[PDB]
Amino acid sequence: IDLVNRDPKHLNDDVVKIDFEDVIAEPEGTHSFDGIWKASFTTFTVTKYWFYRLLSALFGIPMALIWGIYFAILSFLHIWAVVPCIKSFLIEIQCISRVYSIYVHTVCDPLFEAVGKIFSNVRINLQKE
Amino acid sequence: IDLVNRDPKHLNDDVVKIDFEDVIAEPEGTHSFDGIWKASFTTFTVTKYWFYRLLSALFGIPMALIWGIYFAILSFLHIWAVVPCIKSFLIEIQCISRVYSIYVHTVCDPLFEAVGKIFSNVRINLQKE
Amino acid sequence: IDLVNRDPKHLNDDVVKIDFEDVIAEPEGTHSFDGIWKASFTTFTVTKYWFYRLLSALFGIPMALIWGIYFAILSFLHIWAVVPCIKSFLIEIQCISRVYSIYVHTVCDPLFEAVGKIFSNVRINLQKE
Amino acid sequence: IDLVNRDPKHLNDDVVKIDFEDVIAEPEGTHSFDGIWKASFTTFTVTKYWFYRLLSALFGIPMALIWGIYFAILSFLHIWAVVPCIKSFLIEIQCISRVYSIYVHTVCDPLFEAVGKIFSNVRINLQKE
Amino acid sequence: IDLVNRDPKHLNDDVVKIDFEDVIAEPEGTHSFDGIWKASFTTFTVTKYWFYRLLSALFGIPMALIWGIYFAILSFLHIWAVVPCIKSFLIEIQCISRVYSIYVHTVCDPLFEAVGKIFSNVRINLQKE
Amino acid sequence: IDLVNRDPKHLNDDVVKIDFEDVIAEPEGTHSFDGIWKASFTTFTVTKYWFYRLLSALFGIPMALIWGIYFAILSFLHIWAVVPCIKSFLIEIQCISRVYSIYVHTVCDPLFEAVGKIFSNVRINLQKE
Amino acid sequence: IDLVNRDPKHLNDDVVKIDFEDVIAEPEGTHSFDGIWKASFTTFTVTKYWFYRLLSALFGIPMALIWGIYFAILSFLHIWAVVPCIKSFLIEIQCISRVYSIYVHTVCDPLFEAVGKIFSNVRINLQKE
Amino acid sequence: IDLVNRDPKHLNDDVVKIDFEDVIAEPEGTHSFDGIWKASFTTFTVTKYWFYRLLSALFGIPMALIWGIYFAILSFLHIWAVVPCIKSFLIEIQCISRVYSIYVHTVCDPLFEAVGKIFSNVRINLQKE
Amino acid sequence: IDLVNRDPKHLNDDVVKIDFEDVIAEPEGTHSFDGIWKASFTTFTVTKYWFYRLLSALFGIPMALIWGIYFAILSFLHIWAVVPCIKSFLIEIQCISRVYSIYVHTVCDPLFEAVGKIFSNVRINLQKE
Amino acid sequence: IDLVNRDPKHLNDDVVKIDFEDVIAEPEGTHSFDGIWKASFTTFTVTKYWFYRLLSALFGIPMALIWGIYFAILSFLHIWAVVPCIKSFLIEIQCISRVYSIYVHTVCDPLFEAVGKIFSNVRINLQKE
Amino acid sequence: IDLVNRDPKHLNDDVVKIDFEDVIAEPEGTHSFDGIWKASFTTFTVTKYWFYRLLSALFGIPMALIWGIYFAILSFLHIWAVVPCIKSFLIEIQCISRVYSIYVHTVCDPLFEAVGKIFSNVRINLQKE
């Protein structure tokens, strides 16, 4: 139980890291009072810190049980039912594919071979200067 | 009977390996109580561990017998019936293919050879600077 | 609390830095009176300096509280609800994608292979001069 | 009579080699009881082993005689009838092909030679920097 | 207060620099009287010199105050309202984009992969001379 | 009279060489009884061996006489009639071809020479980095 | 006051330099009388020399005053009114452009990425001779 | 009179050389009786040998006289009538061709020269890595 | 006054130089009488020599005066009226061009950037032989 | 008077050289009687030899006079009438061509120069491997 | 007066040089009587020699006078009228061309610059083998 890292996979680490400095910033020259900039910084940080913990405690645990049952059902079906079904499909469709390929290569093959004779008389003259 | 590997083919090894850390993760700063993070980890792991074993025991064995009979029938037909049928198809269609090829090469062959004379007068002048 | 930098991220630092010299400028030859150029410089700088501070004090703090609550709600939903939902979608749509791919590669594959024979008779003659 | 190889041509050796490990496999972590994994392995292997031999004995031999007669008839016709027929076709169609070629090269030949003069004035200037 | 440069940014320095020599010029041979060329030069320079100063004094200062107030309002809205609004838009539209991408890559992906087989049989013969 | 080779031209040597091993083959693991595999091999080989000889004896010789007369007639016509006829065709069509070529090169030749001036102003700038 | 150059900018120096020799010229063999070639040269030069000076004196000066006033008005408006107006336009149109870009990159981006897979199977064979 | 070569030009030497071995051939394994293969070889060779000589004797000589007269008439007309007629055609059509060329180069020449300016601003950046 | 050159600019020196030898010429073999070739040479040269001088004397001088006045008027208008008018046009049309450019680069810019992703997956395989 | 060569120009030397060996030829194996091959050779050669001389004597000379007069008339017209007429055509059509060219280069020239800016942003990345 | 060359310009020297040998020629084997070949050569040469001289004497001189007057008129008009007219056309059409160019470069210029961004993401992978 790592209570320091809590995320050694970098899955949710791009759009869920928000700080006060990443929202509001005054570059230079356009400043405000000292008594207004030291008060807004504290209000934003404290408010969102405590509010998140309240939501995670009420319906955080009754939601983890639901996902546990659902993933178990999907895992069982894939291993024992879907995989054998897909493999058996290849053996069945063998005669149709082989016969169809022979018919196509008999009709349209000579038509597209005489058309390709237009590139057989290319002559290029080059003169460097 | 390898009770450690159970899969020396890496067939189902990409979309059926799911852990708790791959679902829910809190990167940094946005944390929860210590008493809520050590309880959700246990609930998810234990629930899906025991539930999968219950399904595999009830109708795991009566399902293996069904696949045994079905694969035997497909194997016999392919070896003794389909393979000789496809091979005999090539010998039959010989006269049609040979006669058809001669007719096409007699009509459209000269038409596509005079068109290819447009590339026989290419002249290029190059001057480096 | 850095009261000098106030923006170590260069977020709003391109379209919010405006000075008097960046608005009005007389290049050369076309000048005005000395008593009119030293008065307009002071009026523009002083007026916008004090006016900005008045707005930031009235409704600057009651606006920071509103953004604090809103961001907390979005963070919770993404971690615990959206991420597990998207991952479970991949496992469900497996049989449909695999079967569909086999059907397409059986029908149109030989058609687009005989068409590509037109580039198999390219002959080029080159003569340097 | 090789009773070990039985296939020194690798003809049917890709889609007819099926084992238990190639159908059902549990990668890791998602395991079952030891008493359920040692029983399903035996049931699948034994059932398909004996079932195939039953089919091959009943109507395996009365099917080999049928293919013997059919192939003999096709072999005789190809050698003595089809081959002389195709060869005699070339000698007959000689006058038609020669006369037709002369007519096409007389009409459309000059038309496609004046069109190819658009590539005779190519000038390229290059400057490295 | 630089009374010499008055424009160390080259903002308005291309289309507002006009002299007498840049308007009227007589190259050679086609000349005029000496008493007409020394009088038109003085009239153009003096007239536009004094006229510009008259306009800049009347309504030059009452116009600088107006621009001061307007720029202050735009600066405040961008920092505190627009920037947080745009950032929060990205977090909301996450589920829609991810699901839509999966559907498109499932349907049309195999169609555009079999079409690209027409370039897999390119043969080129080259003969230098 | 070579009774060993009987075919020193490799004419019919690709689609008329069929053996038992090229039709039916069991790769590995999926085997049959020893008493069923040594009986089907003999039945297929013996049946087609004797059946072919029966057909070749009945109407093998009365068919060779027919082809002898037919080829003699075609040979005589080609040498004495077709060849002189084709050669005399070239001398007759001389005036028509020469006059037609002059007319085409007079009308459309200048039209396709002014169109080719669009490639006479190509300029390329290259900068390596 | 340069009375020799009068145009150190080469502004009007291409289409306003006309001499007698640039209009009428007799190359060789086709000559005229000596008494007709020495008289036409003088008439053309003298006539246009004096006529230009007459026009420049009458309404040359009353035309320079008009251009003096007009240029002063345009200079004032550009510096004090147009330049601030254009700059303030960029700050206003920020939210619209950013939101619109995100929507386009979400819908049509995956469509044009699967189409580009047709160039991923290029094979070229080269044989020098 | 060469009674051995009879054809020192290889004119009819490709489609008129037919032997028994080029028609019927049994590759290997599929053989016939010795008493049937030594009889068909003799029948085909003898039958076509004597039959050709019978045709060449009956109407071989009365056919050579006919071709003698016909070729004499064509030779005389070409030398004395066709050749002078074609040459005189070039001198007559001189004025029409020269005038027509001038008209075309006057109208459409400038139109196709301004269109070719689209290739005059090509810039390429290359970066090796 | 150069009475020898009379044209040191090569203006009219290509289509106004005509001699007797450039009109009529008899190459070889097809000659005429000596008394007819020495008389036609003199008649052509003398007739056109004297006729040109007659035209140049009658209305050669009254035509030079007309061109003198006309060129003076065009020169004055270009220097004093046209040139200032064109320059003042650029200053006026500044606001329209700048605003229009911003609008176009906001709407259609992202549309033509996602389309260009079809060239980002080019793979080429080369094999020399 | 060369009675051996009679054609030192190779004008009619390709389609008027016909011998007996170029018409009828028996390659090998398919021969005729010795008494039929030595008789057809003589009949063809003698018949066409004497027949040509008969035609050349009757109306060979009365045909040479006709061509003599006709060529004289065409030669005279070309030298004295056609050549001066074509040359005088160029001088007449000068004003029309020059004015027309200026008008075309004024209207459509800028239209086809802005279109060519699409090739000014080409970037290529190359990675050898 | 060169009575030997009579054409030191090679103007009419290609289609007016005709000899007897360039019209009628008998290559070899197909000859005529000696008394018919020495008579046709003389008749053709003598007839066209004397006939040409008769035409050149009757109306050869009265035709040279006509061309003398006509060329004099065209020469005078080109030098004194056409050349000044064309030059004065350029000065008149100056304002129209300059204003029109500015308008076109303002409207359609940005449209064709955003379209050219499709070539800015080209990536090529090469692998030698």
Could you describe the 3D structure shown?
The structure is a homo-oligomer of 11 chains of 129-residue chains. Chain A has 129 residues and is mainly α. Chain A has one domain. Chain A contains 4 helices and 1 strand, in the order H-H-H-H-E. The longest helix of chain A has 32 residues. The first copy, chain A, is flat and about 85 Å long. Chain A starts with 33 loop residues before the first helix and ends with a strand. Chains F and H meet through helix 1, helix 2, helix 3 and strand 1 of F and helix 1, helix 2, helix 3 and strand 1 of H. Chains A, B, C, D, E, F, G, H, I, J, K: Its main location: Golgi. Chains A, B, C, D, E, F, G, H, I, J, K: One of its GO terms (cellular component) is cell cortex. Chains A, B, C, D, E, F, G, H, I, J, K: Belongs to the caveolin family. Chains A, B, C, D, E, F, G, H, I, J, K: It comes from Homo sapiens. Chains A, B, C, D, E, F, G, H, I, J, K: Keywords: Acetylation, Cell membrane, Congenital generalized lipodystrophy, Diabetes mellitus, Disease variant, Golgi apparatus, Host-virus interaction, Isopeptide bond, Lipoprotein, Membrane, Palmitate, Phosphoprotein, Ubl conjugation.
List the keywords.
homo-oligomer of 11 chains, 129 residues, mainly alpha, flat, nitric-oxide synthase inhibitor activity (chains A, B, C, D, E, F, G, H, I, J, K), inward rectifier potassium channel inhibitor activity (chains A, B, C, D, E, F, G, H, I, J, K), identical protein binding (chains A, B, C, D, E, F, G, H, I, J, K), protein sequestering activity (chains A, B, C, D, E, F, G, H, I, J, K), signaling receptor binding (chains A, B, C, D, E, F, G, H, I, J, K)
